[PDB]
């Protein structure tokens, strides 16, 4: 189940890697599909990036005197998915999502026909008019997807915090009092200073399950192997909630406190032997 006939003297060699990190709280479940097609004089690798990026959300006390009633909530303001390469021989010919998509569910399809013909569709609908297709699918309740950077050598997506449903209407990702609440007593736990799990969406509470694609073209001839990095990470904001007994709760946001905390894995493609292997990581 690692080689598939897609029509003609054309087939797809399916390879997959699974690299994880407890430090970064990330898991890369990538699928590297090589496109073998005599009628298309260029190597092509369809990389489908999946896995899990831990929200890394944490509620805790704040050490130091004068802060006994100041609690801290750390959460992911944005998830980061990206793939960059340096080898001159390689170029990114396509990527999904191609444009900014802000619906709760993201479902797109990358199609391929013999003769090097790729086309994308922002829907997982019909209708098998491709020799081979790969699809992305992920939910982002309260978040928005956008292509931060892109060129022939790299692509980088960002799943940003956008708007959240609250007991009292909507609230933006920049609202300083987002997720804060009085804990019903000064003896209340750190967690009680913030919104309960039922009001927190998956991307905040649990984490994010990425699902992205990007095809790489390669010039046949003394360009035997290429390397590229894949980043899965997040940008974290801090939300401090201080209880003034008998008064109320004072909150303050520290936006972009921990940016670019990413887990970068370096891979190598052996175009000739149609094979993949991990060179290293952080
Ligand atoms: Cl698929
Ligand atoms: Cl209050």
Author numbering: 30 to 311
From the paper:
Crystals of LukE12–311 and LukD27–327 provided measureable X-ray diffraction data to 3.2 and 1.7 Å resolution, respectively. Each of the two crystal structures had one molecule in the asymmetric unit, and the two refined models included amino acids 30–311 of a total of 311 for LukE and amino acids 27–325 of a total of 327 for LukD. LukE–HlgA superimposition results in an r.ms.d. of 0.53 Å. Indeed, LukE targets CCR5 to kill inflammatory macrophages, dendritic cells and T cells. Furthermore, LukE binds CXCR1 and CXCR2 and previous studies have identified the L3 loop in the rim domain as the binding region. The crystal structure of LukE provides insight into the residues required for receptor identification. We argue that the structural features that determine the binding of LukE to CXCR1/CXCR2 receptors in contrast to LukS-PV are dependent on the presence of glycine and proline residues in loop L3 (Pro212, Gly214, Pro215 and Gly217) as well as a different distribution of polar residues (Gln210, Asn213, Thr216 and Ser211). The fact that loop L3 in LukE is one residue longer compared with the same loop in LukS-PV results in positioning residues Pro215-Thr216 so that the local solvent exposure is higher. Indeed, the solvent-exposed surface of loop L3 is 1750.8 Å2 in LukE and 1472.4 Å2 in LukS-PV with a different charge distribution. These important variations could explain the different specificity of binding of LukE and LukS-PV to chemokine receptors.
